[PDB]
Amino acid sequence: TNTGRVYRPKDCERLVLYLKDINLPKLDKWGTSTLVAFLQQVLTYQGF
Amino acid sequence: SQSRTMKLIKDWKDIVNQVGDNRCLLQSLKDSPYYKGFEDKVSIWERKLAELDEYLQNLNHIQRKWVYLEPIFGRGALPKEQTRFNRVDEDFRSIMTDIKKDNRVTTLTTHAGIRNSLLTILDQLQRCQRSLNEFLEEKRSAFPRFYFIGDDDLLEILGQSTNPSVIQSHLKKLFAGINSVCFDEKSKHITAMKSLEGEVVPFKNKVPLSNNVETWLNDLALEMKKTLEQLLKECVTTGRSSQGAVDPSLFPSQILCLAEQIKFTEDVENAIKDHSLHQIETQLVNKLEQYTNIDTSSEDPGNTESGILELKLKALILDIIHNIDVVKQLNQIQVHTTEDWAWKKQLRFYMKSDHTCCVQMVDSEFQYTYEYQGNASKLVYTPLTDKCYLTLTQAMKMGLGGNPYGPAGTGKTESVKALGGLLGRQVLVFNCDEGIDVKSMGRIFVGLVKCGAWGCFDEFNRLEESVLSAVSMQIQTIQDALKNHRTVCELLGKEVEVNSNSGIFITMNPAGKGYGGRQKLPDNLKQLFRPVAMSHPDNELIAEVILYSEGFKDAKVLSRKLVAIFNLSRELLTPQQHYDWGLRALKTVLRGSGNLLRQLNKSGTTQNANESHIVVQALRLNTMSKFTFTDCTRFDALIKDVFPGIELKEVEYDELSAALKQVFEEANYEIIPNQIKKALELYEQLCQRMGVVIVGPSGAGKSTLWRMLRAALCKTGKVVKQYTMNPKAMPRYQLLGHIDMDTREWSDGVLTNSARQVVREPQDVSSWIICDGDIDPEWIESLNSVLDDNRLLTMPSGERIQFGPNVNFVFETHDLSCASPATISRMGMIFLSDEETDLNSLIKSWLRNQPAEYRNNLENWIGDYFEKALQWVLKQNDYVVETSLVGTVMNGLSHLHGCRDHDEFIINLIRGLGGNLNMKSRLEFTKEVFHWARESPPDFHKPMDTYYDSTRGRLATYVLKKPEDLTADDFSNGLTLPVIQTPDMQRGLDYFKPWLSSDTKQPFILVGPEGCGKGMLLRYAFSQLRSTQIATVHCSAQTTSRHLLQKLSQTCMVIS
Amino acid sequence: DPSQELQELANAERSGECYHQVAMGQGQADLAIQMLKECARNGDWLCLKNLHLVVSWLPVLEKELNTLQPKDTFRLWLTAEVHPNFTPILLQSSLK
Ligand SMILES: Nc1ncnc2c1ncn2[C@@H]1O[C@H](COP(=O)(O)OP(=O)(O)OP(=O)(O)O)[C@@H](O)[C@H]1O
Ligand SMILES: Nc1ncnc2c1ncn2[C@@H]1O[C@H](COP(=O)(O)OP(=O)(O)O)[C@@H](O)[C@H]1O
Ligand SMILES: Nc1ncnc2c1ncn2[C@@H]1O[C@H](COP(=O)(O)OP(=O)(O)O)[C@@H](O)[C@H]1O
């Protein structure tokens, strides 16, 4: 589209990513997982 | 069936035809010069209609198949099928609910991805069909006639067990006699049946419709046989009284002819016992005179309303003429008693005390099996049919088959069906081709021995050789089961119940000098049959009995005239390959006379000279098409010699010729009266018979004929729907269809699909399946049963597709060196020549396609230089690849458009013509062209190399161009070698340059001796281009279609 | 046609319809071998026919003729036609 390339679910309307486990990924030595930081980026800014 | 509720769709054609109108309207907008500013909206509507068409054309499939497959899985629920069909049910009803919500037609373009939903529903329905195969074979073993219905209609009749539209649409193909039925006032019973012309016979009792389909089809079979049986008894019971039971509305012709023959038989066997009795001969003469007199009471009204069955009279005259000849020969020999074999030679139709017929020849007897035939064309009793009938009846007495044979075009195929008509059986004419499975022949045999029908296996010769060997064991098993009066035979494992009134015959030709590819039959297999000679029929007897039957009075003179015309015209006129004077041309001319006398009594009055004047036009509606010029003139001179002053009358109609000249005027051709004559001629032939050959050389105007008659007819006539095959490009099993060998699954083909599409269409259509390709017998003989007097196309599975009175096949071709004369005598013909073509009439339209900046000089130079240089090249004839005239013309012309002056036009003419010669003649071609031009160049030595420049007006200097860019880095690739520009390479490039530019899209082929410089120079000319994409494919002795198709499809888009 | 004389001979010398026969064609060879073995065990007769079409089958036939262990009163009847490229080995081991 306009304003940058985008992803859209094929042949459906509401794609659902069902993440199985959230406690289980790995901290670094400060306390911040890159996974939960990435999903924070997505659920706040709708992109990456 | 289960009480659900649903909304459904109808009136599809109303929606689809608007879409087709809109797409062709967009194509009409694509020709406007202002399309460049409005292209972008056209792209929208293009893609929109392209989606919507496929969506509708899938949804109608899904609707029809869902309606079919609801009741079957509803009634006999097996859950492994039920889960499948429930998922398909959910996926369909979910779409149809959203259509019930919004019914705007462009919502299907904007639903939630329906494309994969539709394709998956179609695929799952295909899979539940493959699950239903086993149940289909169960019901085919249940009711015997179903082996010739396809699956596609059989599951309809199983499902739609109450729908009247289904019954009237598919009961015709089951019982061949009944064309349609009626219904009572609540659609719960069937009370009557129809015919093709509308002969109506009521049933003696109503027929209860129900769900279990065999439990009322059995009722149809029994109640039809009982109805005809009681109707025959009632007719004969009134007829053996003293007064006549003449009331031809009250009975079908099948009972009239039979009652007259039975009463004739019993009266003559009283006669020869009592007395010679010329009284009975006089009685038959006066009775025949009475019928011919009453025939003039229906002929003058003709087309009335609720009055037909003049045909019941004409189907009675012939039997009366047969009885006349029998009594006259019994008078000529003066037979004493009944046991004298000159009476028992003649065919006898007795009555049994159980009131049913028993057809009895010499000692063998059979039974009448009450098949309702309706109106059909019977035959004239020539004395060859005596031979045929006695051989076949003695062979059936000995428990064997019958194999009539002889040359092409006699009557052996229809003689078997005529015997089946006179006996009361049903006949299922087949075709035998392609080498089908012995199990595939086995199931056909199972159907024939369960029903009780005569397989008339037409073309049993051309069949694969070992299949004949296994079939021999099969036939021997069946004939043993017949001769020992067995009730239970056994082939292919099962205990198939064989019928006592069964029978098998074949028909074939001997594999003579020109009957194509046919394999010789085994000796064992020949020992099972009984051969009959059917070589020569008569020609005077048939032609006089037909004309005397068809109301014409003077048959005894004119029939001999016809036969003498046939014999002289076949005998003295020059023997071309493609002529014919068989029995089929005669049978055509007789109906061509019957139609004209059918018009000229209900439309006027009758008199003397017109009755012998008609037959000249009714003969020249056929015979004029075949001829050349001079042979047609000599044929006219022969027509003058047989008929002294009754010479000529021309084409009656002209209002179609106005539209034809209109359509020529539209498409910017020229207007030639010869093309007009040939097109009107083609319309005559297409009205006359089933198939037309258009013989002609290359490019000489034999496809534009039908191409323009299409539009010229379609402007007034209904619909001309064209389907175009080319039968040699694709393989055989895709063309005619074939069977998967292990699965036993009928794959469809191209023209089987086209035949289904044409028999779908309503009665106000016309369609021309066109096979624009060359002719081999081993496929074109597969259409003998279509191009027959019968009209039927057969699958190797046993499925048989009829045709109505609409369809024509048009066969554009090159020559008929390789076609057997069965097909040549089978279909109509149009001839063309190399004398009728007008070269100037094709030069003028090409000149009319010129942009008006050079046309003065071009016409002034063509009109005095072109014809000499063309005729000199046709005089030399040393040209290396063989072309026709049209080809030489186009090779001359396509190197011209854009000449400036005279001296340039000379050289363009030389490069146009002399490319096809060789070097022994090209030099003196150049010598005569420059000498009979203005002047000579300074290229007097080797004049093949004249370089006309536009810049100075230079004529000729051959100069060598030496490169100076030479390292070893050029030679790095083995290809892309540095081309040294020698004068011959410059001549090649000067040849190539006019045709590879972006204004002349021309295909062309170089000729060179092997290893000479073709590929290098053509790659150089590829490299001179601008925005091309070269894709070289090396062909060899194995290269087929799919190899070039994938070499294309690797580097080519697919846009819809 | 030898078939009628063979049929009358099988009706004369034997009873109960022991006579069994198979023609040679497309799709009959692999059941022909089974019937060969079964009627070799039973001692009943066997009439093969048209051994001039299936020319690339006869090595299997001569292998099975060499291999089998027949019984008494077994009689194998052949029927072939004149044909070039025939196999010598069964021509050795037959009457003609
Ligand atoms: N009335 C006409 N005036 C001028 N040219 C015509 C006319 N009718 C047809 N032609 C030309 O004749 C050429 C060949 O036409 P047509 O395809 O019918 O010949 P053909 O023999 O069918 O070709 P093929 O040899 O490929 O079968 C066409 O290029 C067409 O331009
Ligand atoms: N005795 C006959 N009376 C009238 N028409 C006949 C007779 N015999 C043959 N015909 C016509 O000749 C045509 C060809 O007959 P057919 O049996 O197809 O011969 P073939 O199989 O050799 O072409 C048919 O249309 C048939 O109507
Ligand atoms: N004018 C020329 N100058 C130099 N070499 C040439 C010339 N004409 C032909 N050749 C040589 O002849 C060969 C011709 O190959 P070509 O004829 O294209 O093969 P094919 O006949 O298989 O298409 C080229 O490889 C080239 O080396």
Ligand SMILES: [Mg+2]
């Ligand atoms: Mg053409």
